[PDB]
Amino acid sequence: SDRITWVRISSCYLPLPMTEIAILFAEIETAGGHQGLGFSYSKRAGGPGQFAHAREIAPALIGEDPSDIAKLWDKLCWAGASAGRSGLSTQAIGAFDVALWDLKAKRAGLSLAKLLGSYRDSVRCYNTSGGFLHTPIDQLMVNASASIERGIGGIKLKVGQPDGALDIARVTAVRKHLGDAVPLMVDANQQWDRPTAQRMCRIFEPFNLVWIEEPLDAYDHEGHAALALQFDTPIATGEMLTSAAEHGDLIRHRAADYLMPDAPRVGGITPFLKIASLAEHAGLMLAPHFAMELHVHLAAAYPREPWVEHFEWLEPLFNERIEIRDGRMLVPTRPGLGLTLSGQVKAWTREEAQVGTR
Amino acid sequence: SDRITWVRISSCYLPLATPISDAKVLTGRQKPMTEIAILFAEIETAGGHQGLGFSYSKRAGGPGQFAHAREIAPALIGEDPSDIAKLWDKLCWAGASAGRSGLSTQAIGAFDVALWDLKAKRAGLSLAKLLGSYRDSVRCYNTSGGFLHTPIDQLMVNASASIERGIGGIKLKVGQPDGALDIARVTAVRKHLGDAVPLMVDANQQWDRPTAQRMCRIFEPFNLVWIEEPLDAYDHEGHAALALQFDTPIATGEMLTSAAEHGDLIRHRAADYLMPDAPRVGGITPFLKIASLAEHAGLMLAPHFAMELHVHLAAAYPREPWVEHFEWLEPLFNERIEIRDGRMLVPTRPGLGLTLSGQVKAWTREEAQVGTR
Numbered sequence: 001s002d003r004i005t006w007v008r009i010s011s012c013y014l015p016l017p018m019t020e021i022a023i024l025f026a027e028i029e030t031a032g033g034h035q036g037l038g039f040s041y042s043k044r045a046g047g048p049g050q051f052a053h054a055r056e057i058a059p060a061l062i063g064e065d066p067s068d069i070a071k072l073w074d075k076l077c078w079a080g081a082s083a084g085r086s087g088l089s090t091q092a093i094g095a096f097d098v099a100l101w102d103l104k105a106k107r108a109g110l111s112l113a114k115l116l117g118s119y120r121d122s123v124r125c126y127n128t129s130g131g132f133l134h135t136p137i138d139q140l141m142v143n144a145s146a147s148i149e150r151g152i153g154g155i156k157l158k159v160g161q162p163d164g165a166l167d168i169a170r171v172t173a174v175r176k177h178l179g180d181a182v183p184l185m186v187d188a189n190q191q192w193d194r195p196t197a198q199r200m201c202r203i204f205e206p207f208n209l210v211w212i213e214e215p216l217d218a219y220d221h222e223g224h225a226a227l228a229l230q231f232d233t234p235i236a237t238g239e240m241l242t243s244a245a246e247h248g249d250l251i252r253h254r255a256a257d258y259l260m261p262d263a264p265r266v267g268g269i270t271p272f273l274k275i276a277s278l279a280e281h282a283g284l285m286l287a288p289h290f291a292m293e294l295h296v297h298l299a300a301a302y303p304r305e306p307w308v309e310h311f312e313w314l315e316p317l318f319n320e321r322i323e324i325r326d327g328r329m330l331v332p333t334r335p336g337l338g339l340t341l342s343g344q345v346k347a348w349t350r351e352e353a354q355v356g357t358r
Numbered sequence: 359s360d361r362i363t364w365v366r367i368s369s370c371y372l373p374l375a376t377p378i379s380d381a382k383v384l385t386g387r388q389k390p391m392t393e394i395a396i397l398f399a400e401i402e403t404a405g406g407h408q409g410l411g412f413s414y415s416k417r418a419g420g421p422g423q424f425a426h427a428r429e430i431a432p433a434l435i436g437e438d439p440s441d442i443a444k445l446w447d448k449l450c451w452a453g454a455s456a457g458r459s460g461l462s463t464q465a466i467g468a469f470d471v472a473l474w475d476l477k478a479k480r481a482g483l484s485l486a487k488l489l490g491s492y493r494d495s496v497r498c499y500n501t502s503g504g505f506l507h508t509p510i511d512q513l514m515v516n517a518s519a520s521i522e523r524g525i526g527g528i529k530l531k532v533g534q535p536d537g538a539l540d541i542a543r544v545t546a547v548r549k550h551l552g553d554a555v556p557l558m559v560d561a562n563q564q565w566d567r568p569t570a571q572r573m574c575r576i577f578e579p580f581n582l583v584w585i586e587e588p589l590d591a592y593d594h595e596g597h598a599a600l601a602l603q604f605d606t607p608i609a610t611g612e613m614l615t616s617a618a619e620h621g622d623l624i625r626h627r628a629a630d631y632l633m634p635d636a637p638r639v640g641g642i643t644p645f646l647k648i649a650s651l652a653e654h655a656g657l658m659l660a661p662h663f664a665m666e667l668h669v670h671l672a673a674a675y676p677r678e679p680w681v682e683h684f685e686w687l688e689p690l691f692n693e694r695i696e697i698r699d700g701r702m703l704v705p706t707r708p709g710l711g712l713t714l715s716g717q718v719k720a721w722t723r724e725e726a727q728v729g730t731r
């Protein structure tokens with residue numbers, strides 16, 4: 001069979017008090033001439049950690065059959081056995097895992113979505129239109145309308161400030177400005193305690209929001225389950241979880257209507273697929289967090305209509321762009337992820353290492 | 359209001375006297391373990407107080423731990439050293455996308471341990487007394503350098519030697535393809551040492567459910583202190599089923615890297631003896647949470663590795679614990695653990711009572727520091 005002969009990893013600081021995002025890129029090449037590209041990231045601390053671990057375990061891939069992806073995921077995990085099956089170690093593993101899936105799809109001359117098997121050619125999308133809790137409503141409404149004009153399918157508004165009546169008034173304003181035909185979601189970013197979340201969720205019910213995201217602390221599964229059980233409005237959460245096991249807990253507690261796994265954060269496509277499988281089984285919906293260039297493919301393979309958020313943050317890393325039209329994000333049709341590194345990455349790369357022969 | 363003013367971290371690669379080669383090595387799927395990467399943390403305050411802490415990685419993970427610790431370290435400067443759990447949370451939040459387990463929290467654990475060391479010293483108490491102890495000595499055991507592939511006669515001699523020097527029990531590695539072989543080996547050790555020497559076995563996750571069922575059943579009449587890691591570290595339902603059926607205590611947990619994971623073991627009643635590793639779970643703070651959950655569930659404790667730290671933690675547990683004696687980390691420190699009549703003496707010096715040995719500098723590959731002393 002084929003075998004991995006070369007691997008290169010690099011830490012790229014993408015310029016945007018978040019001033020930059022640390023990206024970990026993984027490049028894998030095989031004796032058969034096949035190639036794959038993958039990545040993971042860290043918004044805050046963690047970039048140097050992911051890279052250092054990735055650099056130490058990369059050699060374990062040399063000589064292995066690229067097609068046995070899950071097997072390799074497990075092998076690299078064992079390479080750092082005392083490091084755990086979550087967190088920084090598996091996120092570093094994720095960059096390689098994504099590269100291998102990219103490579104396999106390309107081997108089949110198919111987009112990642114088609115390799116996995118698709119249910120749709122485009123996915124519903126939304127954005128925050130640069131909106132923040134401190135953004136004047138007037139400014140946000142304008143930016144939101146511009147997004148709808150450009151094809152976005154929904155708007156997610158930040159909420160969770162001490163004065164809840166203010167958030168309610170802000171959402172009412174956007175609803176009036178955009179009309180009942182524009183879907184809206186709110187993200188409390190874990191800012192409410194249980195009683196407040198109960199009161200805020202009850203007030204939002206008549207608004208018919210698509211979902212209320214992270215009303216509680218990321219690990220308060222029982223709290224989230226209680227909210228979901230009681231309210232019609234879907235509860236969304238999961239972006240902070242870093243393993244299939246943590247998502248498994250959410251599902252077991254029925255703490256989320258919309259699961260929000262982040263492939264890079266949970267250790268790559270392999271663990272993401274196991275989470276998606278558990279979610280499908282449990283009858284849940286999917287709303288992947290961040291990294292649309294990767295999640296658009298993963299969402300396309302989910303059986304029930306998902307939502308993917310449009311972000312411009314990572315665009316500069318790649319030559320290709322995502323296309324949006326009429327409230328939906330088009331699933332790329334190029335082989336694999338359909339991504340190649342922009343020449344600009346050269347300037348932002350702070351660390352790099354390679355092993356094997358090309 | 360004291361404040362942290364200086365922090366120093368270093369990555370020390372400790373050479374091992376003898377390489378560790380498990381089944382994976384013998385089957386040619388991995389290299390023998392010949393060193394351990396230690397992450398050392400030193401914290402100093404305006405009030406002049408000092409603390410030393412550490413974490414470690416057996417296989418890959420050292421560079422990652424150090425790298426992360428270096429990036430979050432400055433977040434300690436200016437903070438009150440006494441608010442330990444608060445600071446644990448703060449550093450965790452500084453790398454919130456990294457999760458609450460694994461490499462990130464193991465890096466945090468090195469600082470956490472230094473803070474506890476510093477608080478104990480501030481009170482002029484050993485860590486054990488700071489927490490409150492239930493005993494001045496803890497039952498101990500060792501492997502006597504025995505491995506699955508060590509000649510039985512040699513293992514028995516070394517084991518007799520350990521007992522002679524005061525060790526209180528012997529843990530034997532089992533789990534090879536041919537189970538009858540493991541049985542005969544335990545039988546020989548039992549015969550060589552006598553009925554009065556406690557014995558435990560470690561399968562190191564090598565059995566599948568049906569095999570574990572059969573081996574545990576054969577081992578019942580041996581009255582072992584415990585059968586450790588008979589299954590995969592995450593097969594909670596399998597461990598619980600074994601524990602429920604057999605009298606012999608089931609021990610596991612050394613591979614877990616967070617309070618939440620140990621919480622899962624306890625919830626499933628997957629272990630009679632919980633084996634948390636403070637460094638691996640994120641330090642003393644998470645360890646204490648685990649111990650409280652364990653005490654409440656009525657379980658027993660058998661901390662994994664790092665005796666220099668776990669001797670203090672075991673002393674603070676209500677029910678009689680077991681701590682394993684290892685000589686691996688000794689070269690790193692000037693102090694030594696005392697063993698007598700089957701128990702290891704809880705150190706009485708302030709804090710953890712550890713000071714870096716002169717040999718540590720030479721083994722230091724990476725280091726950094728922030729703030730001024």
Ligand SMILES: O=C(O)[C@@H](O)[C@H](O)[C@@H](O)[C@@H](O)C(=O)O
Pocket residue numbers: 043187189239289290
């Ligand atoms: O859902 C989201 O994208 C937010 O919840 C972000 O992940 C958040 O951490 C932060 O990056 C932001 O943009 O407010």
Ligand SMILES: O=C(O)[C@@H](O)[C@H](O)[C@@H](O)[C@@H](O)C(=O)O
Pocket residue numbers: 378380416560562612662663
């Ligand atoms: O219980 C133990 O100490 C063993 O299970 C070790 O942790 C093991 O990983 C290995 O280091 C060994 O000593 O065989």
Ligand SMILES: [Mg+2]
Pocket residue numbers: 187189213214239
């Ligand atoms: Mg969010």
Ligand SMILES: [Mg+2]
Pocket residue numbers: 227228229230231232233234235257
């Ligand atoms: Mg509901």
Ligand SMILES: [Mg+2]
Pocket residue numbers: 560562586587612
């Ligand atoms: Mg063990």
Ligand SMILES: [Mg+2]
Pocket residue numbers: 600601602603604605606607608630
């Ligand atoms: Mg039992």
